[PDB]
Design goal:
homodimer; alpha+beta; Phosphorylase Kinase, domain 1; Phosphatidylinositol 3-kinase Catalytic Subunit, Chain A, Domain 5; 2 domains; 5-stranded mixed β-sheet; about 45% helix; nucleotide-binding (chains A, B)
Chain lengths: ~280, ~280
């Protein structure tokens, strides 16, 4: 059941069009960014987290991912960044992803109950760990604001294109499947979070998750773990159109590796500390 | 453009199959019930009411409407009928649609804050009025219940297949368009609501909505009116796949006429009473 968007009505790289009576933003490949966005978002769905709707189809010659606009309501997307740039207390600008600064903003913003926002932030961080997201920057999450009211909600998760090794082509996939050092590098060394420590160093997923004593993070780990269903996750990979076999094999393997080598270790410890 | 479900993996006249990694129930035509369901749910969506996701496509040699399963696991559907049937104070059984008994059940259930359920029910009534639903029976709405918790939510609106004159073949369509009598009959005389007055008679949409002193109904009308966007509604009709021109013309006309002859008339009165 593939969808050709070529003929859809365009709304006055990305193009905005109507499909099934609703607005979708369509994203074109630059390598497997379209696949990453799609597969990652479907995995996030399987985790029971609110996420944008995604479809894999074609536009004229090219595989594309179509992302359903959620701003359609008396709702406007306000990204976290916009909120952050108004925290006068922060010397660094809105785009800067220092974690401590990000957490300060979360506690000091007036859109959402901070507790609620904190749970979401750390839920997403766990999903991003599983998915290997190297670019959850401040423009890649946020809020829905009531168009005709001062009403706020947290926006569904979106922009998961920097997940699942988007740059890994068939050649790279094969190099990793045939070399354990190449594989483990892609577990312990990178991808790393775009969130930063106080030395402006990127937060390493394994190192941070296995050593953190942030209760909010540990709680999230405990919340999300049971919702990880590897059977479903592998089925999603299997059922993804246009994907190469070596790409699927690569994804199946890396998902298993990230789950056992990062998530499981971190979760065991979180268990421990809960006691 | 058009989705074909023919090769979709089946989930071991309706078949349950997997599409875009999610379960859909595919409904087959008996005449225009598939179109009715799809157009009606999309109209409901356009009213800002929560509703099941629908797609129109083909399955083998048949036009089908696919409805996305919202009982994504950890949630079970509990229909109003099942709740109503457990209420011993009610003499009549759960399937009975006497309005006053239904309103009593809404007021005396413990799944949902009664004020919230009541607002939902009347919101749904106003949509069903616009859409001409002759069969909003107690099995056609209800609640979602958490599988591991006592948490209940209201289910998205579903089963809109008895809206929008599903039995109107092309001969009926042309007859109605070329005969004001056949037209007015299908506004003022039928479809009627399946809900019943205390004389055990079906509730007439025009009579009831223009004459009711029920404040909850009138408030619902006031809420939903501003969200009726007829351009959007006609676009939904124009953009429905596979639908014949005569069927489109008929729906365009019937929606305009239900809007002007029932909704607008009732809303003017609601406005006057609110002041």
């Amino acid at each position: 059941p593939t969808i050709d968007f070529t003929f859809c009505e365009i709304n006055p790289n990305k193009i905005s069009l109507f499909y099934n009576n609703e607005l979708y933003m369509v994203k074109f490949p630059p390598t497997n960014g379209c696949f990453s966005e799609y597969v990652a978002c479907h995995i996030v769905n399987s985790l029971g987290l609110k996420v944008q709707e995604t479809l894999l189809g074609t536009y004229k010659n090219k595989i594309v991912v179509a992302c359903k606009d959620f701003t359609t309501h008396q709702y406007e997307l306000v990204d976290f960044l916009s909120l952050k740039n108004t925290m006068i207390e922060l010397e660094k600008s809105g785009k800067d992803t220092n974690l401590n600064d990000v957490l300060y903003a979360i506690d000091n913003q007036h859109f959402i109950e901070p507790k609620v926002l904190k749970c979401f932030f750390w839920d997403m961080f766990v999903a991003d760990t599983l998915l290997g997201n190297f670019d959850r920057h401040n423009g890649n999450w946020g809020f829905l604001r009531a168009s005709n009211s001062k009403e706020y909600q947290i926006a569904p998760i979106f922009d998961c294109g920097s997940c699942l090794y988007p740059q890994a082509d068939d050649v790279v996939c094969q190099k990793v499947l045939s070399n354990i050092d190449e594989l483990n590098a892609r577990i312990y060394n990178f991808p790393q979070s775009i969130l930063k420590d106080d030395n402006d160093k990127k937060i390493n997923y394994y190192d941070f998750l296995t050593q953190t004593n942030n209760k909010d993070c540990l709680d999230a780990l405990l919340r999300i773990y049971p919702r990880i269903d590897m059977n479903k996750i592998h089925s999603i990979i299997d059922n993804t159109p246009f994907m190469s076999e070596i790409h699927k094999e690569f994804l199946h393997t890396m998902l298993d590796e990230r789950k056992s080598k990062i998530i499981d270790v971190a979760h065991t410890r979180a268990i421990e500390l809960s006691l």
